[PDB]
Design a binder for this molecule. Structure first.
Ligand SMILES: [Br-]
Ligand SMILES: [K+]
Lengths: 152, 149
């Protein structure tokens, strides 16, 4: 009804789920920074809302592994390549070997952004990232991977 | 002007785009061919209405040129672009190159023509950039200068 796409609206949604976060600023652009501890390793999660021309804004969510895989770079690139076609989101491995998963959505500026939609999107990003992270780490627990993992 | 496939097709048709609406599986989608200076492409658009009152808007471009002989090199090139630029690039087993946009919206979200045109334009521009890099494109042929008349 009244919640629009702004960094403060998304921070509130994250706070409401008791996610610990800080709001930072580089250049002119503010962003939300979060740490996240997955079963198989730690990660950074970033969120920003960037305005553009033509009254359109970009919601960007980014996950990056703390762990690095520089010694398996070609192998990882091909694994991520196949997921980039079959699934949502954009994965890559950088020169240092950290693995990234990114989301970019384009919205009319100050579009309605309901809590349910953001939670679905955000949860979706984390679940896809966790799946890739589990594959890199060869993590395949007997009980199966928990769909909902604590930031802890 | 809500997010429905029919709305998006109206926006494209308003811009004189040639398109067909098709059904595969249970999902309807818009199918288009696109001509770039360095090669042709398939361009697909769908709106998939999912759970938690959230829908996915998907826009996909696929090169008709193929790069299977260069698969590893292309994969690394796309990888680096996937880190630094919008959207998700990949190369498939046949060697065709894909660029995907997958956006999440409240179901039946407002989707003004100005935003869709910016989004759709941005996808095409990014894909053209990648296609140009793959092909090493340089304008090869000049303007014919003979006038009307
Ligand atoms: Br993406
Ligand atoms: K998916």
């Amino acid at each position: 009804e009244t919640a629009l796409l702004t960094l403060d609206t998304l921070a509130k949604y994250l706070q409401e789920k008791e996610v610990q976060l800080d709001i930072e600023e580089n250049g002119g652009q503010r962003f939300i920074r979060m740490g996240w501890r997955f079963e198989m390793g730690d990660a950074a999660v970033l969120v920003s809302v960037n305005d553009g021309p033509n009254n359109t804004s970009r919601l960007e969510i980014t996950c990056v592994t703390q762990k690095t895989y520089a010694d398996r770079r070609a192998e990882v690139a091909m694994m991520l390549n196949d997921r980039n076609r079959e699934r949502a989101f954009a994965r890559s491995i950088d020169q240092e070997g950290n693995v990234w998963l990114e989301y970019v959505g384009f919205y009319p500026t100050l579009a309605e952004m309901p809590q349910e939609t953001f939670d679905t999107l955000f949860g979706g990003v984390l679940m896809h990232f966790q799946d890739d992270y589990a594959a890199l780490e060869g993590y395949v627990p007997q009980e199966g991977m928990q769909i909902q993992q604590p930031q802890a």
